[PDB]
GTPase HRas (Homo sapiens), 166 residues
Amino acid sequence: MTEYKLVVVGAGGVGKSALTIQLIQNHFVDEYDPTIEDSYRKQVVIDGETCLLDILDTAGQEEYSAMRDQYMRTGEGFLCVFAINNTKSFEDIHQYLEQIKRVKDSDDVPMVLVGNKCDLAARTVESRQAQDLARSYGIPYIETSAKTRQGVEDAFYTLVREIRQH
Ligand SMILES: Nc1nc2c(ncn2[C@@H]2O[C@H](COP(=O)(O)OP(=O)(O)NP(=O)(O)O)[C@@H](O)[C@H]2O)c(=O)[nH]1
Ligand SMILES: [Mg+2]
């Protein structure tokens, strides 16, 4: 069956793992557990077709700039995550978008910009700011909360649809 090679990228602590674990395992990882590199494979049905999600959950670590080019080369779609209560994570996601485009030699890579932790009150990134960034890359912006599950399936399934209809 069709496989979708999804890669979840972004700064440390934005919720890359919590989002993936919510999607695959249906619960919220409410603990400190930094990632090295984890892979999740799951058969799902999206819009009436069986497919395999192969999800690579990456490290936010800025020192892993070597494994980073490699997964960017092989990935098909990227969920580019920042946290809406962490302005520095929003500025960091710019560098991920640019690196993907450099490594893939393409301005047309399936991507979704994800503003995570939308359940938290202390928002410092306004939605319009993130919409403008997404629009400059021609990609959707979707807000999520790995805690409440708001937007989680929307974000991942939108990324699949961006690939599928590419
Ligand atoms: N309130 C709230 N907390 C969240 C959300 N997503 C993640 N968190 C919390 O934020 C922290 C970091 O989450 P985690 O998924 O490990 O982040 P990560 O991006 O995978 N970090 P790393 O790059 O080190 O692997 C954890 O305490 C987690 O419970 C969310 O949507 N809402
Ligand atoms: Mg992680």
Notes: The first helix runs from residue 16 to 25. The domain at 3-165 is CATH 3.40.50.300 (Rossmann fold). The two ends are 18 Å apart (CA to CA). Residues 26 and 149 are 8 Å apart (CA to CA).
